[PDB]
Structures are given as structure tokens and as C-alpha cells.
UniProtKB/TrEMBL annotation, chains A, D:
Superkingdom to which the source organism belongs: Viruses
Keywords associated with the record: Capsid protein, Host cytoplasm, Host-virus interaction, Lipoprotein, Myristate, T=pseudo3 icosahedral capsid protein, Viral attachment to host cell, Virion, Virus entry into host cell
Protein name (database record): Genome polyprotein
Any one Gene Ontology cellular component term annotated for this protein: host cell
Record's keyword annotation contains Nucleotidyltransferase: no
Limits of the Picornavirus capsid VP1 domain: 1-192
Automatic annotation (TrEMBL), chains B, E:
Location in the cell: Host cytoplasmic vesicle membrane; Host nucleus; Virion
Identification of the protein by name: Genome polyprotein
Organism: Coxsackievirus A10
Source domain of life: Viruses
Family stated for the protein in its record: Belongs to the picornaviruses polyprotein family.
Role description: Localizes the viral replication complex to the surface of membranous vesicles. It inhibits host cell endoplasmic reticulum-to-Golgi apparatus transport and causes the disassembly of the Golgi complex, possibly through GBF1 interaction. This would result in depletion of MHC, trail receptors and IFN receptors at the host cell surface. Plays an essential role in viral RNA replication by recruiting ACBD3 and PI4KB at the viral replication sites, thereby allowing the formation of the rearranged membranous structures where viral replication takes place.
Gene that encodes the chain: Coxsackievirus A10
Coiled-coil intervals: none
Subunit structure as annotated in this protein's UniProt entry: Capsid protein VP1: Interacts with capsid protein VP0, and capsid protein VP3 to form heterotrimeric protomers. Five protomers subsequently associate to form pentamers which serve as building blocks for the capsid. Interacts with capsid protein VP2, capsid protein VP3 and capsid protein VP4 following cleavage of capsid protein VP0. Interacts with RNA-directed RNA polymerase.
Length: 226, 227, 236, 226, 227, 236, 48
């Protein structure tokens, strides 16, 4: 029929290249610092999209949007530090970890536009995989309180610390939201898209006592209501 | 019927430009690349299905098992053959599918990960006898069964055929892996259409599995460990 | 320096913006890429794979029986077996298929569809069926005489177990919206063409499995957040 | 006479390429979010210009100008989300819809310049049409309370939601004005320009009991006053 | 007089590169492409005018009507011919015009859309008999009559001619459409100059409409629905 | 980075600015364009179409009668029938035409104009008329002897029903402003040249319809918001 | 001047950023370099 409709929107890169909420970090500055374990299966909207495939390799872009409880934007200085695995974790608002000499950091004001950085593919394996069928250790693997059955140690990427650069306590209750965008993406082994509600961040558990049907019920098979 | 080549790719040895560990691997290639038959399963009127996690089903049988638990790194492809026959007056249908990275989900309504239920080791890694499905509808993992046709699969329709064969290459994010710690894929057999017959027909219908590990590589030789 | 002025759209964070950001690790070399089978380049490769429809989506059926359409012997002739809507993003059977789930991620869809019917019974049973697609304009047809005036296929059982019905995309606009009246594409019905005939010492009931998919000319338009996830707290 | 006067100003593109008031959205933040159904026949100045033609195809540019009741510009963060047809509508200031993972969004401060984005031609038909003579359904079409006689379902383009990105209630009364500019325009079938006052946003109704003359009255046909 | 070609374009079949629905359309082309005559209207001293919504006036007459209510998609052009004659001592003038997408407006002063007045179905889609104008001055739609010369139109001036003919192609935003749900255009006849004569002259002046649907296409065949 | 400084005009939103904005949907492909008749490329194509003037814009006439100029038999000779101003943006008859409505969207206008007069009476009636355009300088002419000193046309009734009068753009500036004294272009008058003569058994009254339009050299300058809409609330 | 808009990532000090800064001493000529033994080009020479 000489069809000219357009199929470019259906590619993986255009499907995955849009920022989405990944993390929320709460700071009291009453401790003086907050930390967050980088793990992006905490929110369901990005999790459902990412778990349609078994293997995924991509670069990322992280944006940080920080506000207060009331929403004001008073001018303060904040330090964002990325602490890779192994490196010491900051212990106070003035500890020796905050003089970052090899670690990357971003100094940003609360009145500034949201901060934005680029991150490469950082896995010791060849791709990030969300499903790892096995244990990361030779052992006995007890049959009651199992855990460690879906660790995938190839996915552990360190922590994110945030502090208020100040002489003393600033008495500021802050909330920073971390938005991630996928760039230069490749994917392998598509899987069924989850139908059951999520329960845990790191496990695929579902409520067996309450299973939801994948299609809404209708009165009879001879109607066309549902 | 036909033969399914998973993702249209034959199994092969790990090539140059794709290897990381530097030592000569072993290739027995005749005493490991052969067909092994498991003990069969009784298909009944209310059977829910069975599964086998594959780089452990053969982990304790034969020269393949000895190589697997002597060496630390493993890599190979597989050929899967499921058999089930009945008379011309029987009816039913089975879906046979290969799920890469088939992670079994715990069944419970605990929202705190500290005390959440988890499958025991045997349920995750059944061995040679397999395990039965608790909820075939959600594939025991929270994802629907209807979409398992995205995986490489075959049907045993009792009025059409009695065998299902899948040829599958090596799927992993690393060229080599440990066969005691990681199960690369699982094989599921589920009767979506129940088995029916009439009086006087045989009531004992068995289902049998036969596998062949093509293109086997092992490396990192040391003492024999199996757990 | 160079004189300039700042335009509206300054200092805004667009979630779908295409720009550059500062790298955090200079000189970085990633892990080399290996060959993994099953690479995916678009979702349209996944819309074309056949996947089971939950046609028996009633209260009585729970579990796997929701995917089985029963077929037995009748004695009233020209009877109706099943009927369902052909909109993939609508609630109903298509909710259980992959193409439906992907179509729920977009606002507009276009192209033809395919439904395959697979008969499960004994080798000795046989019959014929009429599978009819009817474009919009009226309620669901009330008899086979009305239903056969649309697009249809007559299917007899044999060595080949399945039949295919192509829904051919008869529309006025180039695109349709997944319930965003002026859309919905018609109804599929399944009627007994002759009967279900079996010899003695054989079960009188059998099943049919339906499997839905897209076609070569299928396409989607305008990405959006789906409506099949729910948020209540932050741990899930 | 060798006339060199210039006619470029009279083209359709130059006639239609100027921002105009399209929408006004009021937020109380006392609910915590506001929504607006995208429909641009709510203000008469752009409506009269757009209804001089039957069919119109164009791209658009949307600008958002947000202020308070008194007019102050205190620094707060706002999220602008576009929800296409079908997608779930946000239910609270913290609901799961606001972690936009496939939907487009703009985070903008009240102290920032007005936000500005580009929008393509998004209709399932080939052009937007303001006059649709018919009903979008096979039925009975009752003769008393009719409605649905000018729906034109080819014109339904989703909603716009706006919220204050904050930990809790900010107690801010906001008002955001949406200005639209037409770009790359084509038009078909010119029509008479409306003479009667407008009464409804989606219907062409006019007061029959009070019809206004298209020309002002003068005393006699033999004078030249009016 | 002359013949008006609306927008200077002849009607035609929907070509390649412009079609969306994929199936072979039907073209009767002799039993649908012909002239149909409606029942006439009595022009009187205070008649306000009449209109016909066109892809429904023929929706119930002949093979065209049967095709229209059997098929779901329709597309064609038209030829319109209005006739009215009087003696050489009569005087008057009629404007005959074709309005694409002629949406009829409700007549009332309610500013809340929930309880605002709306035309009934028959007033919107009169059928074969048409409807009479309530307010010809505002074209029953809130727009002036004087500018209806922007539409393709003709005048019947009783001292000049007695026929008006307009050839009109298919106008729509989609290549095909439903003829039961959408009226592509309306035809209006209005006496802007009243009819006058003297005693002894005929007082019965009729006005008649004859139409021909050129280049008819139908598609999406199913059962016959007309509402 | 690159040194620069920000100039006046920074952070301003100009309603008529010509810049770029960030797209919201990347990779987007619109619906393909079809062929629609009646495409419009400029408003000047619409200014040239003839449209009726509301010359009878008095209190007595309401409805369609506001578009009809009566013509009957006189007995005082050289009588005046009608008169109106030729400014298209001014209040009066031109307010009811399309070229007037478009000229109300601009500040300055230039070029010639056209008015067509169409006689509606019986075939047997006949007469002659003098249609006169007079450039500015004095009040409206008080007799045909004064009116005939300007531009004019003598029109007799016959097989052809209409006549055309061209108002030829006699000005001193290249443009005129639509009431923004130094403008207004003169007056058009319509006089009985001989009479309205009819045989017995025929009505003694007939009508004339006037229709106004622009010309080839017409042009407009400086867009502006019109003064024929009114705002009181936000629903209309 | 030239129309532009400022993007997210504005006004941020990235510790590992690779940009330019304004020199404090124009026309400056450093002390000439001499030959010193034991030059090191990477840490990998020291891991061995």
C-alpha cells in the first residue's frame, strides 16, 4: 500500500533513553551526612522496563535534584562524593574522607540547576545481568534462611555520600532525588514482563496467597466486555 | 516435528579475543559429549510441571561430572530431548521451554527482606530428579506462563508428536563459569492442557529427559570439590 | 568575551533531553564485550512472537484453565464458541500477551494482527470451525449467518493442528489510540461450523489454545508510562 | 507603477507564529498537584484566528510562566509532566506517577526564566480539524441531550500535570500560564470568521435571543457616518 | 450559466501512497454513480432556506445506500444540481453553497456546557427531506452569511438562470471514512432576495435537488448497519 | 571554558521570538500527510474573494434585508440611492466582508479595491445607474452633477446582471492606517441615471446586492490584535 | 548577542573535570628542564 509510518521510535535506545527516578536520599544535618547504596531496583517503573531483558550493557547519566522539606532553595554548598567498593566511607561531616583526592566529587549549591554527570559501563563482567541463578560462594547453602541466592557480585558499584560543606551544623532537612538515564544501550535475552506486584528490592518474591490474574475477569466467554 | 536451534546459534568453543583466563583447557569431547538419560516422571491428571537446573543435573554423573567437579571453570552447549508417548485415543499438551537464568522466587507476603521467605538449596538446585511447580501459572517466579513462548520452546501435542528437541548454545555474561555455583539455564515441562483418556486405556504415562553436552570445555584444574 | 544572551528554556531539566554531561573517570577503559546470543535491537522484534491469550478470563477459570477454550459435541447446530475484542491495549485476553504489554507502553498503534488457534484433542476427534473478524459498526453478531459476512476462515482439524486468522487493519485513520468510540477495530468470533465428532471410548471434551501476535506492518507511536505497575512505598 | 510594497507579512506562517495565551492552571499546594486538560479553544483571541480554516497541521512550542498570588518569585522546584492518553494520572504529590520513567518532564525553579519546549504534530489523522460534523460512535444519538456531536476524537492529546517537588506541603498558591506558538503551519478550507460571541469551549453555540449585527447601525442609507 | 469545480479539483479514487487500510475496495461505478432526484421544496414569500448533509441524504436510497450501510469505509466525490424556474415576470435570488464540515450550533444562552442546549439527531442529520434554517443570517452556526461566498457556490437569479451545478471532490483529513457517522459536507440553499410576483402569476414555485456520487469507493465489508 | 558576557535582552520571553526549543519526544515520526484540496498559502488569497457588504446597516433592516439595496421607480429625477465610505477597516458596511475582517488584523493597508453590484428584478424591468467614487476633500456630493466629476461608471441592466466599480487607490502616502483625518479614501455613491421602468403586472420594487473585494496590488502591514472579540471569563 | 540557554550541570565543580582556567602570570617562562634519571611514566612500571 506504500506504507510510510515510521518505526524508529521502537528501538531499544529510544525506549531506554529517558531519565527516571532511581533514588531518594534524606539528610538531617541536625550525623551531618547521608549515604545511599547505589542500586536501581528500588522503584518499579524503571525496574519493570529493565527486567524485560536478561543482559544489559550501557552508559548512564545521573542527575541530582535536591530540595528541603518545605521546598525552599536557600543558598548552601553541598558535596556529592562517589565512594567505589573498598574505599573508606565518610564518618562525620568533617572527617578525612571528604578531602577527596582520588575519589570524584561535585560541589553544588542548592540554588543551582540540578547536577548532572556521566558514568561509564563499570562491571567486571561483560554486561549487567538482573537475573543470576546461583550463589557467589562454595559452601553449604542452608535450606531455611537462604539469602545470597541472587547476589550477582558483578553488579556491586559502591555508594554515594552527600554532605553540607559548612563550619558546623546547618539545621537543614534535605532530600535529594537521583534520576538515571541510559545511553548507548545493548540488550540480550528478552523475558516475560512481570505481572505480579513487587515485594522486595533484591528478590523476585511474590504473594502466593494473593495472585493477580493477568487479564481482568468478564462475565462470560461469549461476551466482549472485558 | 522439527528441531529448535535456540536463538539460531550453534554451540562452540570459546574463541580467541573472547577468553580471559590464561591456561590450556581440557576437551574430553567423546566421554562428555554423549546422551544421558534421567529417571522419568509420572504424568498424572493434576500434575503441575517439573524443572531441571542444567549445569547441575549432570554434575554428579559420569566423566562429565568428574570433570565438572575437578575443574573450576566450565563452558558448553547442550542438546535437550524430552519424550512422552500415548495412544491415539489420549489427549493433552505439554510446553517444554528453556529459561536462561531461571531464578526461583520465594512465595510469601513479607515486605522486609530480613525475614522474607527464600527457597532452600535443593529447591533452587534440584539435581537429577528435578522439582515440581507450586504455581505453574506465574512460572514460580512472578512472571506469566503465557509469555514463556519468548523463550526457545516446543510443544508435545499427543495427537501430533511425542518428542521435543532443543539445541542451545552457551549463554552467559562471562566466557567461563563455575558449574557448582551457577546454573546457566533451566528446563521446564508443564502440562497446560490436562491429560485425558477413557477406561481401558493405559494410565501410566511417563515423561523422560535425555541430554547431550556439546562442545565441553573445562579449566582451572585442582582438587575435586562438589559443594 | 563573546556577547550573548540567555533564552527561555534556560536552567531546565528535561527528562528526555539529548545533551552531554561531564565524565567522572577520565582515561577509563571498560571491560571488553563478548558475544552473547539473543541480541535485541527493537521491541518490534518481540511484538511478532506468538503468545497465549487469556480468552477464558472469567471468574470460574483460575490458573492454567484461563488459557483453554473448551470444545465438545453440540446438538443445536451453528452454535457460538467464543468471542473477544481485537484491541491489544484494551483490558481482556490481550492483557496476557507480549504484544499487548508492549502496546500498553505507547499511545497509538497501527498495522495488522494475527491469531493462531491450536487444537488439542485425540487423534480420532475431528471437526470444523468458523473464525470470523468483523469490523466495527454494530454489536457482536448474533448468528453465524451474520458473522460469515465479514472476514473469516473455515478451519478443519487434521495432521496440522493449528490455523491462522489475520486481522487485516481496516481503519480510516493511519493510527488508532489504545483507549486514550472513534477507535476499537471490531470483534473476533469462533463458531461451530459442523460439529465435534468422536468414536466410542474417547473423551467428549477437548481444548483449543489461542496465540496472538503482530504483523510486518505493525508500528507504535508516542511512548508513555504503562498502567500495570503500582507504587505505595520505597522498597519494592 | 513599479510597485515595491512587500507581501511577505501576509503569509500563513507569519500570521500564526506568535505566542498566545492558551491555558491557566491554578495550584494550591495547601491535594498538592494540579492538572489541565490540553485544549486550546478556551481563549477567544487564538480561537478566532485558528477557526478561520477547517484543517490545520503544525508543530508547536509551549512556554510556561508560573507566578504566585502576590507575584513573588520565591525559589522552589516544580515538576511539569505531560501524561499522554491512557497513562495513569498522578494521584498525590508523592505518588508513583511522579517518578517519570517513560513520560516527559521538566524540573524548573520559580526563579528561572519561563520554561520552553517543542511539540510535534501528534494526531492519528493527517491534520487537526476544529469542525467535525458527526458522532464518534454507532448508536441511537438521542434527540434531547445530545452531546458527542462534535467530539473529533482525532484531537485528544492527554493532560498536563504540575506539582511542587518538596518533602511536604509548601503552602504556595501558584498560577501557571501556558502560551503556545504555531510553527511550520499548513491550512485548508478557509471559512467565515466568527461574528457572534463565544459561549462554550467545545461547541459553536450562540445566543439566538441576542444576535449581534455584523455592521454597526447608521441613521440612513444615504449618509456615511457608520 | 457555468459549472463550478470546487477548489479546481476533480474527484478521484484514493491512490497509492495515500491509503492506510489494506484490503481490496469495491467499485460498483454504474449503479452508484448516477443521478438521484429528491422531493422538492415549496419556495414561499418568507422561506428561510434549507440544507442537506450529504453522506446521509443518499444513505437509504438505492444500490449506493445498500453499499454504504453494508461497508464500513466510504469515499467519493459528488455533483450537485439545484433547479428552480419561474416566469419572466418573477424576481428573486437564491444562494446555493457547499460547506465542508457544516457543524450546526445550538441556539441558547447557557454558559455551562453540562446543561447547554444541543441540536437533536434529526436536525443534525436530516436525511432525504432536509431541514429549514432557524437563523439564516448567522448560517445557524454563529458565522455570517455574507462570507459564505468563500465556499464554492452559485446564484440562481430568476432573471438570469434556473440551474446551479457544483462539482466537488472528497474533502477529509483521512482517506476513508464512515458514511453513517460522519457527514463530509452540507449543501445550503437560501433566498437572500425574496420571491415576488403579481396577481395571475403562478404561486407554486418548487426547488429540486439532483445529485450524482462520482468515483465511489467502499471497504471493510461486514453485515448491514445503518445507525 | 570559553569566556563570554551576557547582554541586555537576557532572560526575556519575546512572544514573537524566532528560536529553537528542546524536543520532548526523540525519534518521533508523525502521521503521513495526505492531499487535501483548498490549501491556503496567504491571507491575500482570501482578500481577493468577493463578499457581501451590509450597506443597509440601519435600525429598520434586520436579518438578510441588511444586504439588499431597494430600487424602485422615481418621479423626481437624478435621485440618490446609496452612499458609503470606502475605508475597509472602518465601522460600517465593510465590517460584514472578509477583506474588512482581515484588514482589521493589520495596522496599514494599500492598493485598489473592487465593488460589484448585482441587480435582482424581473427580466422585464430595466434601468441605468451611476456609481461614483470621489476622493477625499469635501463632504459627500449633494447632486449627481457634482458626483459625476469624480471616478464613475454608468451601468445599464441587461443579460449580464452585475457591474464592477474599481476604486483606484489615489493617495499621497504609500500606506493608509485603519483609524489608528490624514486617511480615509473618499466616498462611493449610487444614483439613478435614468429610472426604473417596468411593464404592467410586474412588481415596482427590486433589489441590488453589493459585493466588495481587494485587488492585485493590495497589501497589508503590521499585524495586530483585532477589535472584534471580547473576553469576560475563561470558558468561551 | 548569540542566543543560548544554560543546561543542567551548570555551576558545578567536578573534582575530576578537564577544563581550562585563567593564568595568573602572563608571559611567564619557567625554569628550564634538566635530565634526571629514574623517570616514571606509569604505576605499572612499579607494580612489576
Amino acid at each position: 500500500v506504500v506504507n510510510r509510518n515510521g518505526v524508529l521510535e521502537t528501538t531499544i535506545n529510544h525506549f531506554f533513553s529517558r531519565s527516571g527516578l532511581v533514588g531518594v536520599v534524606n539528610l538531617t544535618d541536625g550525623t551531618g551526612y547521608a549515604t545511599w547504596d547505589i542500586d536501581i531496583m528500588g522503584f518499579v517503573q524503571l525496574r519493570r522496563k529493565c527486567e524485560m531483558f536478561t543482559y544489559m550493557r550501557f552508559n548512564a547519566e545521573f542527575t541530582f535534584v535536591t530540595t528541603t522539606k518545605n521546598g525552599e532553595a536557600r543558598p548552601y554548598m553541598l558535596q556529592y562524593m562517589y565512594v567505589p567498593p573498598g574505599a573508606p566511607k565518610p564518618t562525620g561531616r568533617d572527617a578525612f574522607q571528604w578531602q577527596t583526592a582520588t575519589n570524584p566529587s561535585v560541589f553544588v549549591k542548592l540554588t543551582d540547576p540540578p547536577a548532572q554527570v556521566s558514568v561509564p559501563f563499570m562491571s567486571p563482567a561483560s554486561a549487567y545481568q538482573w537475573f543470576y541463578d546461583g550463589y557467589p560462594t562454595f559452601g553449604q547453602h542452608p535450606e531455611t534462611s537462604n539469602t545470597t541466592y541472587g547476589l550477582c557480585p558483578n553488579n556491586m558499584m559502591g555508594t554515594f555520600a552527600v554532605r553540607v560543606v559548612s563550619r558546623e551544623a546547618s539545621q537543614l532537612k534535605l532530600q535529594t532525588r537521583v534520576y538515571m538515564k541510559l545511553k548507548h544501550v545493548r540488550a540480550w535475552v528478552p523475558r516475560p514482563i512481570r505481572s505480579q506486584p513487587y515485594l522486595l528490592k533484591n528478590f523476585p518474591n511474590y504473594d502466593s496467597s494473593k495472585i493477580t490474574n493477568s487479564a481482568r475477569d468478564r462475565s462470560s466467554i461469549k461476551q466482549a466486555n472485558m | 516435528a522439527n528441531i529448535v536451534l535456540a536463538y539460531g546459534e550453534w554451540p562452540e568453543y570459546c574463541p580467541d579475543t573472547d577468553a580471559t583466563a590464561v591456561d590450556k583447557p581440557t576437551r574430553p569431547d567423546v566421554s562428555v559429549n554423549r546422551f544421558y538419560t534421567l529417571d522419568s516422571k509420572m504424568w498424572q491428571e493434576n500434575s503441575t510441571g517439573w524443572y531441571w537446573k542444567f549445569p547441575d543435573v549432570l554434575n554428579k554423573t559420569g566423566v562429565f561430572g568428574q570433570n565438572a567437579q575437578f575443574h573450576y571453570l566450565y563452558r558448553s552447549g547442550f542438546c535437550l530431548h524430552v519424550q512422552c508417548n500415548a495412544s491415539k485415543f489420549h489427549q493433552g499438551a505439554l510446553l517444554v521451554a528453556v529459561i536462561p537464568e531461571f531464578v526461583i522466587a520465594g512465595r510469601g507476603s513479607n515486605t522486609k527482606p530480613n525475614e522474607a521467605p527464600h527457597p532452600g538449596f535443593t529447591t533452587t538446585f534440584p539435581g537429577t530428579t528435578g522439582a515440581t511447580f507450586h504455581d505453574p501459572y506465574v512460572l514460580d517466579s512472578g512472571v506469566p506462563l503465557s509469555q514463556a513462548l519468548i523463550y526457545p520452546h516446543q510443544w508435545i501435542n499427543l495427537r501430533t508428536n511425542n518428542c521435543a528437541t532443543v539445541i542451545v548454545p552457551y549463554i552467559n555474561a562471562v566466557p567461563f563459569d563455575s558449574a557448582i555455583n551457577h546454573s546457566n539455564f533451566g528446563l521446564i515441562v508443564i502440562p497446560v492442557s490436562p491429560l485425558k483418556y477413557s477406561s481401558g486405556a493405559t494410565t501410566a504415562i511417563p515423561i523422560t529427559i535425555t541430554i547431550a553436552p556439546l562442545n565441553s570445555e573445562f579449566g582451572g584444574l585442582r582438587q575435586a570439590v562438589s559443594q | 568575551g563573546i556577547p550573548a544572551e540567555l533564552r527561555p528554556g534556560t536552567n531546565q531539566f528535561l527528562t528526555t533531553d539529548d545533551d552531554t554531561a561531564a565524565p567522572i573517570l577520565p582515561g577509563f577503559t571498560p571491560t571488553p564485550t563478548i558475544h552473547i546470543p539473543g541480541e535485541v535491537h527493537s521491541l518490534l522484534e518481540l511484538c511478532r512472537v506468538e503468545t497465549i491469550l487469556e480468552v477464558n478470563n472469567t471468574t470460574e477459570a483460575t490458573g492454567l484453565t484461563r488459557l483453554l477454550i473448551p470444545v465438545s459435541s453440540q446438538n443445536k447446530a451453528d452454535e457460538l464458541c467464543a468471542a473477544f475484542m481485537v484491541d491489544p491495549g484494551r483490558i481482556g485476553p490481550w492483557q496476557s500477551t507480549l504484544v499487548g504489554q508492549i502496546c500498553r507502553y505507547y499511545t497509538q498503534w497501527s498495522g495488522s494482527l494475527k491469531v493462531t488457534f491450536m487444537f488439542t484433542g485425540s487423534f480420532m476427534a475431528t471437526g470444523k470451525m468458523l473464525v470470523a473478524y468483523s469490523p466495527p459498526g454494530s454489536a457482536q453478531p448474533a448468528n453465524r449467518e451474520t458473522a460469515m459476512l465479514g472476514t473469516h476462515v473455515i478451519w478443519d482439524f487434521g495432521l496440522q493442528s493449528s490455523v491462522s486468522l489475520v486481522i487485516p487493519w481496516i481503519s480510516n485513520t493511519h493510527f488508532r489510540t489504545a483507549k486514550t468510540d472513534y477507535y476499537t477495530a471490531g470483534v473476533v468470533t469462533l463458531w461451530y461450523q459442523t460439529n465435534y465428532v468422536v468414536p466410542p471410548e474417547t473423551p467428549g471434551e477437548a481444548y483449543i489454545i489461542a496465540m496472538g501476535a503482530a504483523q510486518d506492518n505493525f508500528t507504535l507511536k508516542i511512548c508513555k508510562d504503562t498502567d500495570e505497575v503500582t507504587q505505595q512505598a520505597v522498597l519494592q
